Amino acid sequence: KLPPGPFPLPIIGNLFQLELKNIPKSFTRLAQRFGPVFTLYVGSQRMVVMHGYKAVKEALLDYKDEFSGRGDLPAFHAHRDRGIIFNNGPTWKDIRRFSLTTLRNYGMGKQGNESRIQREAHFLLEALRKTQGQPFDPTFLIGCAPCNVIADILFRKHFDYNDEKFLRLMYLFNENFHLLSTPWLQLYNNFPSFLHYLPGSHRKVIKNVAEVKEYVSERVKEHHQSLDPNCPRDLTDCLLVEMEKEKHSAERLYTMDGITVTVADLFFAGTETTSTTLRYGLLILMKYPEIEEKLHEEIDRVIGPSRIPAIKDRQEMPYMDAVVHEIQRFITLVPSNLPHEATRDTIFRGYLIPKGTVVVPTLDSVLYDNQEFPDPEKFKPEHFLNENGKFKYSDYFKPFSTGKRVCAGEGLARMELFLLLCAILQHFNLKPLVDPKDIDLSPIHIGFGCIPPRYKLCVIPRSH
Numbered sequence: 001k002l003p004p005g006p007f008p009l010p011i012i013g014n015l016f017q018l019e020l021k022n023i024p025k026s027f028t029r030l031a032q033r034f035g036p037v038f039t040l041y042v043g044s045q046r047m048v049v050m051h052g053y054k055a056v057k058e059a060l061l062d063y064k065d066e067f068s069g070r071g072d073l074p075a076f077h078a079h080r081d082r083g084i085i086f087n088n089g090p091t092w093k094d095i096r097r098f099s100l101t102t103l104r105n106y107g108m109g110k111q112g113n114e115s116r117i118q119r120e121a122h123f124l125l126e127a128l129r130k131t132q133g134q135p136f137d138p139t140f141l142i143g144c145a146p147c148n149v150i151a152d153i154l155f156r157k158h159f160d161y162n163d164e165k166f167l168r169l170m171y172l173f174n175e176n177f178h179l180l181s182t183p184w185l186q187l188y189n190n191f192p193s194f195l196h197y198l199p200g201s202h203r204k205v206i207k208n209v210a211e212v213k214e215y216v217s218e219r220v221k222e223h224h225q226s227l228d229p230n231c232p233r234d235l236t237d238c239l240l241v242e243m244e245k246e247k248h249s250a251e252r253l254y255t256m257d258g259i260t261v262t263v264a265d266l267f268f269a270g271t272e273t274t275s276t277t278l279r280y281g282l283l284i285l286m287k288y289p290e291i292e293e294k295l296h297e298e299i300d301r302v303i304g305p306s307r308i309p310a311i312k313d314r315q316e317m318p319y320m321d322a323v324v325h326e327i328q329r330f331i332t333l334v335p336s337n338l339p340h341e342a343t344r345d346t347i348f349r350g351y352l353i354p355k356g357t358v359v360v361p362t363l364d365s366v367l368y369d370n371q372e373f374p375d376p377e378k379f380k381p382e383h384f385l386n387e388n389g390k391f392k393y394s395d396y397f398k399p400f401s402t403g404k405r406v407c408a409g410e411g412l413a414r415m416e417l418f419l420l421l422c423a424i425l426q427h428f429n430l431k432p433l434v435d436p437k438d439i440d441l442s443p444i445h446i447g448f449g450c451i452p453p454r455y456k457l458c459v460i461p462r463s464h
């Protein structure tokens with residue numbers, strides 16, 4: 001027997017039970033009705049949804065290997081079963097393991113992630129000053145910071161903030177994440193063959209993915225022509241070197257195409273989610289100026305107005321720590337996670353879950369638990385503050401997921417969020433164009449991601 005769920009119709013399945021523009025809300029509605037594990041058909045693809053901390057944790061932690069597969073995502077068919085993110089094949093385990101180890105090597109030491117982020121803060125602060133306290137759209141300014149950070153690890157390359165190629169890549173990342181959060185792409189994701197050769201915004205996503213891949217492909221090729229296996233320059237070099245070291249084996253983990261997919265995965269994933277979180281963070285703080293003020297107080301007391309922020313500052317800045325945690329919790333940036341897949345026939349809570357079934361370990365339902373976070377729908381730093389006014393740790397903080405497919409750059413992202421928000425607020429006050437009271441924090445699109453409203457602001461200097 002399958003987990004309980006709604007009776008499906010011919011062709012469309014349970015499409016009437018879903019609001020295309022807010023799938024996460026529909027999951028939640030279905031959870032009250034059927035419980036923390038339920039079956040759904042969207043089209044002819046059967047899925048099982050986990051909802052709530054217990055179900056999600058059990059799925060990812062007690063059934064590690066059973067649900068460690070990756071569900072298909074037609075828009076990213078040019079990556080399927082290659083690289084990391086969209087890899088449901090036999091190369092996933094080893095490519096992931098090697099990529100994690102390599103990322104850790106580049107993150108460790110005095111030339112590590114902290115220093116890399118600190119250097120990049122210089123350019124970020126420079127760009128913010130150059131706005132002269134005039135209105136500007138933050139989207140493609142602040143996004144440069146994580147984009148350059150991951151580019152350094154991948155290509156040992158640094159872009160000027162208005163390099164045309166650089167802006168184009170970020171534009172593509174932004175459009176994709178945006179469009180992948182819209183009702184049309186949600187329909188396409190589930191009915192790809194009915195919809196693919198019709199007109200629609202799905203074509204742009206597909207075109208955009210191919211364009212990022214092509215750019216990464218050329219970079220991989222330029223690295224292969226000028227390689228020195230004794231002195232690795234970046235992550236692509238390490239992957240290229242690993243490819244030569246297996247040239248006489250039976251089965252191959254590394255293709256030139258496998259590597260560009262792997263690196264385009266990291267490039268896209270290393271840029272877009274960090275950029276969106278920061279951008280969403282700035283909007284949030286502008287709605288709550290008293291929160292911005294307390295942060296300004298903590299920075300000036302602990303770090304002072306001049307010294308560059310460092311990761312260990314987190315340990316002496318409980319309010320910033322709580323705020324950075326609360327931004328990630330409140331926005332539920334990837335609210336349905338990435339789709340998992342059953343690797344074999346599995347019995348979960350006495351329910352049959354057949355091989356190939358899509359498994360959805362819902363994240364918003366963990367981030368919005370009303371027992372762990374009383375008033376979950378509200379932005380409150382005190383969701384992460386104890387009695388002593390100190391940081392209050394929570395296991396329900398899972399915006400990166402958990403288990404075998406846990407976000408490959410969790411540590412990078414968290415250090416970026418802390419250091420860069422610290423840097424920004426050390427040197428600037430945030431000025432909204434509209435009154436704080438009229439700021440709407442609701443996402444404008446909800447799908448693969450949660451998309452912030454478009455806005456402009458001024459940043460007014462603190463330092464001179």
Ligand code: HEM
Nearest residue numbers: 084085269270273274334337338400401405407408409413
């Ligand atoms: C706020 C920033 C970020 C968020 C919210 C986020 C979130 C996530 C989530 C929810 C998943 C799916 C986990 C699962 O399937 O169980 C994921 C996967 C992944 N992320 Fe992130 N991530 C962020 C930053 C990053 C960064 C900086 C990188 C690269 C350095 C990155 C690379 C990846 C990769 C390669 C995967 C696929 C893992 C796999 O399939 O085995 N992410 N991320």
Ligand SMILES: OC[C@H]1O[C@@](CO)(O[C@H]2O[C@H](CO)[C@@H](O)[C@H](O)[C@H]2O)[C@@H](O)[C@@H]1O
Nearest residue numbers: 020021182183184185186187188200201
């Ligand atoms: O169809 C799903 C979803 O797509 C939207 C736009 O997001 O409309 C698309 O599909 C309609 C067919 O149902 C077309 O008439 C329209 O041209 C196309 O944009 C939403 O209206 C709809 O919910």
Ligand SMILES: CC[C@@H]1C(=O)OC[C@@H]1Cc1cncn1C
Nearest residue numbers: 177180268269270272273334448
């Ligand atoms: C389709 C892939 C998903 C997406 O678009 O945004 C989140 C997820 C890819 C991802 C994983 N970690 C960071 N990102 C950007």
